[PDB]
Amino acid sequence: QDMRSEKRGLAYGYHSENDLKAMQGKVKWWYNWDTQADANVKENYASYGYDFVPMAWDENFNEEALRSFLDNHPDVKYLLGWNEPNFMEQANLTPAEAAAHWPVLEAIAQDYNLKLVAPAVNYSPGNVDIPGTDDDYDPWLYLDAFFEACEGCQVDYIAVHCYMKYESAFSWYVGEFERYNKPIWVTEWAGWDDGGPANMGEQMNFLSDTVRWMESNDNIYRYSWFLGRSSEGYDQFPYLDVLLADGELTPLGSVYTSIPSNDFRYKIPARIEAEGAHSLTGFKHLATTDTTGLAKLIAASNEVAEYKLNVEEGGDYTLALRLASSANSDIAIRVDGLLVYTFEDINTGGVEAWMTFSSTPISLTAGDHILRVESKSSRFGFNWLELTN
Ligand SMILES: [Mg+2]
């Protein structure tokens, strides 16, 4: 398949080569808050299609290690600036200070032909004084003061952190940063504040809502989920982990890496994870215990899933669905809006009893097509689909 997302990255510092291969061609870049790539992948990450974005975490970073790493990786194209300088417990730099030290990063960007990402901000506890305001917590008041102190400074991108749990809050809050007229990097996000996700499925729904919004926002240059693996583990609140055992994904990690960009098109024959729909009405996410697929979509009613196909060899394909359904369930299949097959009285006897149901052949001409999977007032689980010729 083509590269699944050009924007999608990951925040994690302990990749193995097997971890990078598990996500290959579904994750484009990553960063680790440090000046060089993870030790076990430093030599080979570029061969799996990734680019690594180094970071100057605060003003006292190790410039020698960063310049030395850059010397041997001319594939590096971007440099992240200070990390949460408006937080006391992080980089702890008032706007003037962060601009004062910015030439160190420009000199680096000049020597290696790099682009510079602004210091990452978020609503802060307010303990780094911004001049001329009492609202020291304010990420926009911080960046304004930064930019006014940084006259003539090379700043190519904005970096944003966000831990809101509501996808509409998230899109409103990240959109506020489009005011600066620069592409945006959401370099840390997950649903976490105000109680966060009630369960793993809530986090997967929130990841899906916000990933889909960012893939459709042209002003978002890049995003990276927080984070590859957590100290607490993937089934502990707030269910952050994208990677499970070496070289394998969590259910959430399957949703994260499967969601396609606007222009990506699936080639066939292929198996396509259900969580890789270009478009979801109503469908929700859960872990599955099926032997493959990691995550399922769940239907209670009339939910719709659409899959955008680049059919290179027109002809008749059989469509297979991997389903679970306690009772009788009906599923309509459409191509560019017109019914072609209906799965009737699907019944596996349990919500985690899985079977593969095949259709009669469906004619799929060469070109661009929307494959639509509609629940027909049915209650079932949907792991992946397969088209074969
Ligand atoms: Mg799946």
* 279: containing domain: 266-388
Is the Cβ–Cβ distance between 227 and 32 less than 8 Å? Answer: no
Q: Confirm whether residue 113 is marked as ligand binding.
A: no
Residue 174 to residue 117: CA distance in whole angstroms:
15
Residues 194 and 330 in one domain: no
Question: Which phi and psi angles does 68 have, rounded to 5°?
Answer: -65, -45
Q: Confirm whether residue 49 is marked as ligand binding.
A: no
Residues 232 and 352 in one domain: no
Residues 332 and 242 in one domain: no
Residues 240 and 307 in one domain: no
Which one of 258, 284, 310 terminates a domain?
258
Residues 230 and 340 in one domain: no
Residue 63 to residue 44: CA distance in whole angstroms:
23
Residues 33 and 153 in one domain: yes
Residues 68 and 85 in one domain: yes
Residue 62 to residue 69: CA distance in whole angstroms:
11
Is the Cβ–Cβ distance between 52 and 37 less than 8 Å? Answer: yes
Question: How many domains, in total, are found in the chain?
Answer: 2
Ligand 1 centroid to residue 102 C-alpha, Å: 45
Sign of CA dihedral 246, 249, 251, 256: positive
Is the Cβ–Cβ distance between 16 and 40 less than 8 Å? Answer: yes
Ligand 1 centroid to residue 295 C-alpha, Å: 4
Sign of CA dihedral 87, 88, 89, 91: positive
Ligand 1 centroid to residue 347 C-alpha, Å: 19
Question: Half-sphere exposure of 94 toward its Cβ, with a 13 Å CA cutoff?
Answer: 11
Which one of 230, 258, 286 terminates a domain?
258
**87, amino acid identity:** F
Q: Confirm whether residue 293 is marked as ligand binding.
A: yes
| Experimental technique | X-ray
117: β partners: 80, 157
Ligand 1 centroid to residue 46 C-alpha, Å: 28
CA nearest neighbour of 1 among 352, 387, 389, 335? 387
Ligand 1 centroid to residue 290 C-alpha, Å: 9
Which one of 198, 227, 258 terminates a domain?
258
For the stretch 221-257, what's the b/e string if a residue is b when 16 or more beta carbons lie within 10 angstroms of its beta carbon? bbbbbbbbbbeeebeeebbbbbbbeeeebbbbbbbbb
Q: Which long-range contacts (CB under 8 A, 24 or more apart) does 25-33 make?
A: 25/1, 25/49, 26/257, 26/258, 27/257, 28/3, 28/222, 29/53, 29/222, 29/224, 30/224, 30/228, 31/55, 31/80, 31/187, 31/224, 33/57, 33/83
Ligand 1 centroid to residue 292 C-alpha, Å: 7
Residues 236 and 160 in one domain: yes
Q: Confirm whether residue 383 is marked as ligand binding.
A: yes
Cα–Cα distances (Å) from 154 to 59, 105, 185, 326, 382, in that order, read 17, 9, 16, 59, 48
Please give the structure tokens belonging to residue 289.
Answer: 């215990």
CA nearest neighbour of 98 among 111, 112, 115, 81? 81
Question: Half-sphere exposure of 47 toward its Cβ, with a 13 Å CA cutoff?
Answer: 6
Residue 3 forms part of a structural domain: no
Ligand 1 centroid to residue 275 C-alpha, Å: 6
Q: Confirm whether residue 273 is marked as ligand binding.
A: yes
Residues 235 and 367 in one domain: no
Residues 291 and 212 in one domain: no
Residues 303 and 355 in one domain: yes
Breaks (C–N over 2.5 Å) after residues, the chain:
none
